[PDB]
Amino acid sequence: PQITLWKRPLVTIRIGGQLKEALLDTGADDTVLEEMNLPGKWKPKMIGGIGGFIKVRQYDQIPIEICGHKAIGTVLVGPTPVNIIGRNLLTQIGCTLNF
Amino acid sequence: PQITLWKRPLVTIRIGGQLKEALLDTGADDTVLEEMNLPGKWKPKMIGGIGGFIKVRQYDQIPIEICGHKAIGTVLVGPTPVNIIGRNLLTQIGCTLNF
Ligand SMILES: COc1ccc(S(=O)(=O)N(CC(C)C)C[C@@H](O)[C@H](Cc2ccccc2)NC(=O)[C@@H]2CN(c3ccc(C(C)=O)cc3)C(=O)O2)cc1
Numbered sequence: 001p002q003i004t005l006w007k008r009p010l011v012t013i014r015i016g017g018q019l020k021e022a023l024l025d026t027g028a029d030d031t032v033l034e035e036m037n038l039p040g041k042w043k044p045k046m047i048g049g050i051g052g053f054i055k056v057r058q059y060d061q062i063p064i065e066i067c068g069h070k071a072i073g074t075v076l077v078g079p080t081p082v083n084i085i086g087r088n089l090l091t092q093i094g095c096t097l098n099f
Numbered sequence: 100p101q102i103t104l105w106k107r108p109l110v111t112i113r114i115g116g117q118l119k120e121a122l123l124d125t126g127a128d129d130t131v132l133e134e135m136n137l138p139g140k141w142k143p144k145m146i147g148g149i150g151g152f153i154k155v156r157q158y159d160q161i162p163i164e165i166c167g168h169k170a171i172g173t174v175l176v177g178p179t180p181v182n183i184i185g186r187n188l189l190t191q192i193g194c195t196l197n198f
Contacts, residue, residue: 003196005186009125024196026108027124027183032149050131050148050179069198080149084126087104095198097102097123099168099189 001067002098013085014065015075020083022066026097028086031064032056032076045076054078069093100166110166112184114174119182121165125196127185130163131175137161146175153178168192 003009009024018036032047042057056078063072066085071092102108108123115137129146141156155177162171165184170191 001198005125005189005194005196008128008186009196023126025124025126026104026196027122027126029107047149048180049150050146051151051153053150067198081147082126084149087107090104090198093198095104095196097104097108097125097194098197099100099166099192099194 011067011085013067013083015062022083022085024066024090024095025084025086026090028084029088030074030076031086031089032078032080032084034077034080034083036077038062038075038077042077047076047078054080056080064089066093110184112166112182113164114161121182121184123165123189123194124183124185125189125194127183128187129175130173130183130185130188131155131177131179132182133176133179135176137174137176141176144175146177148179163188165192 010021013022042059045058046053056076060074062075071089112121137158141158144157155175158174161174170188
């Protein structure tokens with residue numbers, strides 16, 4: 001598909017029985033999801049943006065479906081106001097910027 | 100061009116006769132540049148981000164050439180972690196996400 005940017009590029013993602021709306025975000029190195037109690041091992045991390053840093057939990061090799069496309073990779077879980085699909089997964093579903 | 104996402108989508112911009120590098124950021128509503136001088140009237144504003152809120156200066160109707168494509172619009176100047184080109188200007192240069 002082609003997604004214009006007149007509005008926020010929100011799409012439906014699936015992570016383990018939770019469907020969520022998330023931003024396809026070319027400005028995000030990593031994927032950052034709203035607080036959720038995922039199973040498995042994790043490591044603490046800090047990530048920074050406008051306003052400063054938040055503390056997140058890094059989970060590896062988590063399967064996630066994005067607009068019906070399969071992906072699997074690292075997801076950061078913490079008190080983000082919005083679910084963010086970063087470049088680590090955007091590449092996996094074949095996403096490019098075009099102009 | 101077509102820009103893939105295995106690396107940060109950084110491009111050269113021209114603004115006020117100066118060249119800068121900026122991040123094409125589909126997850127950003129607004130274009131926000133690091134501290135710099137721009138001519139003309141500005142308004143104090145506050146914007147949000149992943150880590151909280153910051154104070155910025157709002158300059159309206161500013162020309163920027165983004166990777167060879169002309170835009171004229173709102174530029175916010177303040178303590179963003181990196182220069183970001185948001186949807187307000189990405190739309191102007193005809194940028195879409197494609198997968
Ligand atoms: C290492 O991995 C990372 C992934 C993501 C980030 S990030 O989220 O800080 N950030 C990095 C960028 C600033 C260089 C990605 C941006 O696209 C990032 C994604 C995002 C975060 C929080 C809320 C909305 C959108 N966008 C922004 O910072 C701004 C904030 N923002 C926004 C925030 C709040 C509001 C309100 C309250 O009305 C309106 C707009 C917006 O539209 O873009 C940082 C690191």
